[PDB]
Amino acid sequence: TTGRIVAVIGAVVDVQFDEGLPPILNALEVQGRETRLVLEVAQHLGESTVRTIAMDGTEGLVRGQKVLDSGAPIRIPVGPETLGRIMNVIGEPIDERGPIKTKQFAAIHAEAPEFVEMSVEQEILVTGIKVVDLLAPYAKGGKIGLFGGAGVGKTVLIMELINNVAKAHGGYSVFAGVGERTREGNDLYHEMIESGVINLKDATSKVALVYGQMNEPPGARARVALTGLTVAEYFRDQEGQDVLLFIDNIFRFTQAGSEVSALLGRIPSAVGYQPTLATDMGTMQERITTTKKGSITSVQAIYVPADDLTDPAPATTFAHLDATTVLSRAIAELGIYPAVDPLDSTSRIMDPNIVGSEHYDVARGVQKILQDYKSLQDIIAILGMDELSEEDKLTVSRARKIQRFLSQPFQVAEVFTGHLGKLVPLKETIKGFQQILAGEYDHLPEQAFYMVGPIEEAVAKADKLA
Amino acid sequence: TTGRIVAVIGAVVDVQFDEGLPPILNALEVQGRETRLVLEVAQHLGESTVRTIAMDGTEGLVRGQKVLDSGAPIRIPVGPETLGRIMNVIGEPIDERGPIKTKQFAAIHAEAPEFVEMSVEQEILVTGIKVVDLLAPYAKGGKIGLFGGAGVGKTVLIMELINNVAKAHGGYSVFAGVGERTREGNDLYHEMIESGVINLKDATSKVALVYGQMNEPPGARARVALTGLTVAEYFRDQEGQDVLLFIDNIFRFTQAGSEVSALLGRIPSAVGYQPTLATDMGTMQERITTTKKGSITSVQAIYVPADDLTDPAPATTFAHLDATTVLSRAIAELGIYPAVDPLDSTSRIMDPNIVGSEHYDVARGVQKILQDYKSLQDIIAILGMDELSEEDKLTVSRARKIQRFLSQPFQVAEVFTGHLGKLVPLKETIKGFQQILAGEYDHLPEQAFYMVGPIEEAVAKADKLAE
Amino acid sequence: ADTSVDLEETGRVLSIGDGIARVHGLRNVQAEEMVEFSSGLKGMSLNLEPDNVGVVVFGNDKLIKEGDIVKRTGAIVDVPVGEELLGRVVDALGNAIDGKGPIGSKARRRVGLKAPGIIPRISVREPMQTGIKAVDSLVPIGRGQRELIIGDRQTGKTSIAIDTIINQKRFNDGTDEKKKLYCIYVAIGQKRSTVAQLVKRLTDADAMKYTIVVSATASDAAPLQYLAPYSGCSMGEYFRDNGKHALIIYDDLSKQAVAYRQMSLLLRRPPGREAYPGDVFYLHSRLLERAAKMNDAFGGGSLTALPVIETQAGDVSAYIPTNVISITDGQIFLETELFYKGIRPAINVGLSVSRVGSAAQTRAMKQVAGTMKLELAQYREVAAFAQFGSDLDAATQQLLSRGVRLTELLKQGQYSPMAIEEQVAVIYAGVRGYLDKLEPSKITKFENAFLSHVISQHQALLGKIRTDGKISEESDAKLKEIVTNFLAGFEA
Ligand SMILES: CC[C@H]1O[C@]2(C)[C@H](OC(C)=O)[C@@]1(C)O[C@@H](/C=C/C=C/C=C/c1oc(=O)cc(OC)c1C)[C@@H]2O
Ligand SMILES: Nc1ncnc2c1ncn2[C@@H]1O[C@H](COP(=O)(O)OP(=O)(O)NP(=O)(O)O)[C@@H](O)[C@H]1O
Ligand SMILES: Nc1ncnc2c1ncn2[C@@H]1O[C@H](COP(=O)(O)OP(=O)(O)NP(=O)(O)O)[C@@H](O)[C@H]1O
Ligand SMILES: Nc1ncnc2c1ncn2[C@@H]1O[C@H](COP(=O)(O)OP(=O)(O)O)[C@@H](O)[C@H]1O
Ligand SMILES: [Mg+2]
Numbered sequence A: 001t002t003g004r005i006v007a008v009i010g011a012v013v014d015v016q017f018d019e020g021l022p023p024i025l026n027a028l029e030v031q032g033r034e035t036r037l038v039l040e041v042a043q044h045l046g047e048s049t050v051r052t053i054a055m056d057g058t059e060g061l062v063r064g065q066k067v068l069d070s071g072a073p074i075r076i077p078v079g080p081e082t083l084g085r086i087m088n089v090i091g092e093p094i095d096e097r098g099p100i101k102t103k104q105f106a107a108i109h110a111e112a113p114e115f116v117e118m119s120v121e122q123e124i125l126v127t128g129i130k131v132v133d134l135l136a137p138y139a140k141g142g143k144i145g146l147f148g149g150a151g152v153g154k155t156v157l158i159m160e161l162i163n164n165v166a167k168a169h170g171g172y173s174v175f176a177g178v179g180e181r182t183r184e185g186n187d188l189y190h191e192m193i194e195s196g197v198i199n200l201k202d203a204t205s206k207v208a209l210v211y212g213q214m215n216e217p218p219g220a221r222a223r224v225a226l227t228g229l230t231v232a233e234y235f236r237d238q239e240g241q242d243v244l245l246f247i248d249n250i251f252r253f254t255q256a257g258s259e260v261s262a263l264l265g266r267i268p269s270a271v272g273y274q275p276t277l278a279t280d281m282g283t284m285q286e287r288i289t290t291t292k293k294g295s296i297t298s299v300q301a302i303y304v305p306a307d308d309l310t311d312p313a314p315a316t317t318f319a320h321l322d323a324t325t326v327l328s329r330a331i332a333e334l335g336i337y338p339a340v341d342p343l344d345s346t347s348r349i350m351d352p353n354i355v356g357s358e359h360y361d362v363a364r365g366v367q368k369i370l371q372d373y374k375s376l377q378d379i380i381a382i383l384g385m386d387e388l389s390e391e392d393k394l395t396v397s398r399a400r401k402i403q404r405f406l407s408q409p410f411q412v413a414e415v416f417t418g419h420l421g422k423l424v425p426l427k428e429t430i431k432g433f434q435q436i437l438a439g440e441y442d443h444l445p446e447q448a449f450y451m452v453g454p455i456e457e458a459v460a461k462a463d464k465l466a
Numbered sequence B: 001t002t003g004r005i006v007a008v009i010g011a012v013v014d015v016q017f018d019e020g021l022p023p024i025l026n027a028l029e030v031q032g033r034e035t036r037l038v039l040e041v042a043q044h045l046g047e048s049t050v051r052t053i054a055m056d057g058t059e060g061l062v063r064g065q066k067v068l069d070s071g072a073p074i075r076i077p078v079g080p081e082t083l084g085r086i087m088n089v090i091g092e093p094i095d096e097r098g099p100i101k102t103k104q105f106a107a108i109h110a111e112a113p114e115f116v117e118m119s120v121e122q123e124i125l126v127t128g129i130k131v132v133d134l135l136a137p138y139a140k141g142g143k144i145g146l147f148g149g150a151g152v153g154k155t156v157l158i159m160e161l162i163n164n165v166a167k168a169h170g171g172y173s174v175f176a177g178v179g180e181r182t183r184e185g186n187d188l189y190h191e192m193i194e195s196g197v198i199n200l201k202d203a204t205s206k207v208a209l210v211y212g213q214m215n216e217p218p219g220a221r222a223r224v225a226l227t228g229l230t231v232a233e234y235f236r237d238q239e240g241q242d243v244l245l246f247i248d249n250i251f252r253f254t255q256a257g258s259e260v261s262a263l264l265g266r267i268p269s270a271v272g273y274q275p276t277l278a279t280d281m282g283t284m285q286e287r288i289t290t291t292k293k294g295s296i297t298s299v300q301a302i303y304v305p306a307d308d309l310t311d312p313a314p315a316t317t318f319a320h321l322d323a324t325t326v327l328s329r330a331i332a333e334l335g336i337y338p339a340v341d342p343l344d345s346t347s348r349i350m351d352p353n354i355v356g357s358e359h360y361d362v363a364r365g366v367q368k369i370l371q372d373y374k375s376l377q378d379i380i381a382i383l384g385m386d387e388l389s390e391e392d393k394l395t396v397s398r399a400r401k402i403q404r405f406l407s408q409p410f411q412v413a414e415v416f417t418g419h420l421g422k423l424v425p426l427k428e429t430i431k432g433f434q435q436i437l438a439g440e441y442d443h444l445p446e447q448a449f450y451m452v453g454p455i456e457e458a459v460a461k462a463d464k465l466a467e
Numbered sequence C: 001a002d003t004s005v006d007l008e009e010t011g012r013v014l015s016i017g018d019g020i021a022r023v024h025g026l027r028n029v030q031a032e033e034m035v036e037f038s039s040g041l042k043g044m045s046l047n048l049e050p051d052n053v054g055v056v057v058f059g060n061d062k063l064i065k066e067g068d069i070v071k072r073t074g075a076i077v078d079v080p081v082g083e084e085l086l087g088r089v090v091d092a093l094g095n096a097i098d099g100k101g102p103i104g105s106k107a108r109r110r111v112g113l114k115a116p117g118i119i120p121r122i123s124v125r126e127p128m129q130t131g132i133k134a135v136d137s138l139v140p141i142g143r144g145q146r147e148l149i150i151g152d153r154q155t156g157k158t159s160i161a162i163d164t165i166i167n168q169k170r171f172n173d174g175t176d177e178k179k180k181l182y183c184i185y186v187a188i189g190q191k192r193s194t195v196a197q198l199v200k201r202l203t204d205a206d207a208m209k210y211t212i213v214v215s216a217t218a219s220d221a222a223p224l225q226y227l228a229p230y231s232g233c234s235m236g237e238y239f240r241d242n243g244k245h246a247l248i249i250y251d252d253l254s255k256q257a258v259a260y261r262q263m264s265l266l267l268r269r270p271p272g273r274e275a276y277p278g279d280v281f282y283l284h285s286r287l288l289e290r291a292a293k294m295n296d297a298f299g300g301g302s303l304t305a306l307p308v309i310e311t312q313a314g315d316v317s318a319y320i321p322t323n324v325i326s327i328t329d330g331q332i333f334l335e336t337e338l339f340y341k342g343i344r345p346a347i348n349v350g351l352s353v354s355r356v357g358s359a360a361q362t363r364a365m366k367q368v369a370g371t372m373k374l375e376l377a378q379y380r381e382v383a384a385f386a387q388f389g390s391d392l393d394a395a396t397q398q399l400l401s402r403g404v405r406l407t408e409l410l411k412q413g414q415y416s417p418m419a420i421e422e423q424v425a426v427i428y429a430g431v432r433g434y435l436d437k438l439e440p441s442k443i444t445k446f447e448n449a450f451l452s453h454v455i456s457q458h459q460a461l462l463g464k465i466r467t468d469g470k471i472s473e474e475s476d477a478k479l480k481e482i483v484t485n486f487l488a489g490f491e492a
């Protein structure tokens, strides 16, 4: 079917049709252009017109221009032939390696797996990161989220995790770069090449890459998540595959949504956001999940605007994760890396019946002491430690060393820490933390604990200081 | 006249009359309903269409439905035959005891008493509540207001006042529940009965009741207070008696309005309130008043959204009162009931020329020390207590003790406090404080001063505490 | 003359977007009536305008296009109701989602019915035992009462609800029908996998048998999530109106409000404070009023509600938070501070209340915890006022010594709801000063020991306290004996 461009504003193009009005979600192809310009139908304004969202810049379009109903929604190449390739929101390759030749094509809009399809197995996923493992452990086929204001560590953490987990993973992986830096995509691709996860020679790549960065018009950014998502869904269901899905940054999607929302003509909700915020997050977040058919462990980076966690975007996201790593500027500025907030990060697995009570008890042990420190903090602030009780000063000591032991060098951040990256095994973390708690190290200096792997290394660092 | 419904959007219904447009305030009845639906005309949109507020649910209404102009604002059965009964916004009995056979009926809408109708007598109305009495005495025929955020004691306080005052009161009483809890009207009704304030067998009923609870549509809520108030004005004017008016909670009248305001097509004023708040409040509050004909003693509970006394509503109401009891979650949070704020509660009669200087000097004395202590609280907090002068550490003492002596076990809260309710007489109050202020108890422990009636119980309790 | 599509009982979509259809005929629809779309998709007639009907859609609006035929239903929205639902998971409309077959319903009920008035009810008098000391002792919940669970994310709000539902096996597995309590759990805006987890645990606890779970999750259309609470409510009134007892959890009313806000704004209704419709208070009041205690004249049945609300930065003063706190018969406020501190449940004594008081408590309980609440309040204060041991007397040293001991006793784990008599025993021990000399750290361990002792050896005292429902003079004397002695052996 052929409609005509009626109006154009940013990414919101209104197209009128005479004989066949395309259903909502259908992808239209604008005619008369050097490159593909897909329009996704958003609503029927009545009067035989449809209001759509462009998937690329709209410059050049002209009223009266011809548009064609694709007859379906954005459909993209799915299968193993996407492995090792970089693709667009609309599924075209952007790696200058030819067409992605697949048997099947999938549409980016699907419904979420049903209740009966859900899974409830809960297995811990050890990452080698002390704070995470101890206090807010991730879980196989689970939902993890890294909350972070600007330049706090979200991406570095994803990388480190990709390194520590993705690297030695059996199944496939899907990275989806949403609204982030182009150079990052580039940084990754080439790195992926090097360590061979991407092989440009054979069919041995384990990762499929989807990108719609900081340079795309809103509509694209608003859909790429869906795109990466789809690719992942394929491996899950069609091959009962155990997937890994990394997204940077899912905040961008919502942001993108707010960009076109006014254009769609909606009264804004709080903070200028689109009134459909939650539902949009919803029908999207709900497809990123493990099922009876397959497993999807997904790590998603969540940008926090102005550092405000009460912002509708992040706020609304907590409810979709199984484990959350809230990064803090305050901590990072203190020099603690990863800048994880220990009293603010949580995990549905932090249950004695799952991590064992030994784990459970150190975990809550640690938090309790930090909480305690916390109350003392008002006073230490005006009057310092002097006026403190002998007992109080002891929590403080311990807390300052527990606080220091929570930091750790990542390989990925070697260039900045000036130290060699470390991976600590769970039992090593459970342990090192007991001892600290248990006063086994009240003699060592704080500094000894800073920036180390296992406790054993902390003892040594103490000798070196002394 | 007969109009048709042309649009339905929530509580607001637009009606089109072919001939003769019902004036503003007129009540219209929707034809074809198992239950009586009244629509109050709110505006004349033009084109012979009026915009109205529904006095009940709008489900089931259909575009084109018939509507007759009743030819008059909502009129309710007013009179002595209302006593002991339970009424609707629209004057229907809701107690299941049959019609209300009044000689006359009254429109809930009416002009407020003129300036030359005002009265200026001011005589203390003792309540038995240490705090109120001591520091913010209520006045017979005056306007009293109980301010408090959610769950701080507004209702309980209104409850104990009914007990300590309504109960002996020789005259009528009208309690209007506006936008409050239904559970509550049932508690109260059944209490009025078990205590004979309400009599179901005879005409000894001394209290009429009107209700428009939280389970109602904005429309009803915007009016019950009027109904209530209307019943009360009768006994004031047409009978000339001493009325006691209780409204819980007048805030609901205002929130009711805000709830339909947008559908009426208005730009919001600040805090979301409708732009007519004050005037809306004014034309109402101005009726709730004592005149030369009769006397009203209104006790209105006033909700404080988010605990913010500055909220346009609570804020706008202060001027309508002669006496104010301000309750605080910060106080309640400590277990001090009634949680009145001693430094934020006021009465127009707190005048030496009116209550006397012993009264006065005490009150003021009590307030100075509490203020004096407030100022220090935050400081000795950090800097500790040592550096404080004995002079200054005795007021910390006496203050903390007073803070307690101000609490009191209410007779309506035994289920809450686990203590028998005490009522204290004015002099027992004045004296008790007078003494604390005098240094006459610097030996007893604070705790001895917590949740007790008269000062003697504080002394007795010291001993019991003495192990 | 094909007369099937006249504009009085049918209409045609003028436009559709964002779940709002602006339908063209529907001349005889009634406000709030349900209509049907060609696609078998049901919607609801919310705006009846001069020239169009604004229809809210109970599903994916993707299947609707300009021109579609819309049909009246003649019915104001309703849903399946009754015993058939127990043990089943339904969506916001009633349909099963546990793929365990159709529901055998013979009864329906409008989702939107006014709460019973003044006349039909009687003061809440029968307890509704949570199984949680803290709750059952300090902020009692009776049947027909509405008590709010409020706190930030992850402070444990749902757990309070789960433990409660689970604690109800006691009576339901029992004989007495009056003591039985059917439970309803409404998940709103929540995540499918979380709910699926939830229903598992309930099943693993043998609680599903008496529970119905209405689910209106994250990807469910706004209107589904919106309706969900009223839906579940209606299923509860069944029991309430039939002399049976029901308990309904609205988890949580925060996400429903956003759905309401969305639904509402998309209908072009001017946004109000905080962007929500001017009537959000009403949206919740209307609902929670329905939880109620009917007199014997109406079956004496009841509906008890436990709505959940999520604060941000533990700010309870917040507009919504306060909107709901002013409707319910109390609140349970959970703080993350307390939580981390070890105080689990993170109930904040001072800030949580019960407007029902002891009337919802057994004499046994009233006996032990009658003054405890204000005691602890007063404790917390002096505990603060002496974070510097300022020239402190005895009455206050005793005050802090009890405070701490009692605080330890109110602590409690998950999934192990205690029986009323059990609670009385343990509180007893504390309140009576028998533990004033034990080391705080010891307390928890003691309670496990003690409770062990009486349950195993002394079930006669337990059964009497339980049975008499009071603490007689001899029971109080057999108790003293046990605690004091055991305590000693224990303190060897
Ligand atoms: C406001 C930051 C808070 O976040 C923490 C989690 C603590 O809050 C509580 C509840 O625990 C906190 C008060 O202080 C931080 C402590 C930071 C410590 C920084 C240490 C740095 C440091 O420590 C050393 O020992 C040697 C070092 O350099 C060689 C360096 C840089 C922790 O991350
Ligand atoms: N784990 C770490 N250890 C040491 N330094 C780190 C670490 N993580 C982040 N940094 C420092 O912080 C900078 C920002 O890291 P990065 O992972 O990019 O933050 P981000 O959350 O991705 N920023 P953006 O995405 O722009 O909000 C890094 O380049 C390092 O300088
Ligand atoms: N009494 C308890 N003792 C120990 N752990 C508890 C307690 N009750 C709750 N939990 C745990 O504390 C965490 C919070 O539980 P939960 O009730 O889900 O809080 P919540 O308010 O529902 N969180 P969310 O709804 O995700 O914002 C979970 O790990 C529970 O297992
Ligand atoms: N006078 C009082 N003494 C003891 N506790 C009280 C008193 N008034 C209030 N409380 C506590 O406060 C709760 C709320 O009081 P209530 O009148 O409902 O609040 P509101 O002011 O919100 O109407 C009561 O259920 C009770 O537990
Ligand atoms: Mg980044």
Ligand SMILES: [Mg+2]
Binding pocket: B154, B155, B180
């Ligand atoms: Mg009240």
Ligand SMILES: [Mg+2]
Binding pocket: C157, C158
């Ligand atoms: Mg929850």
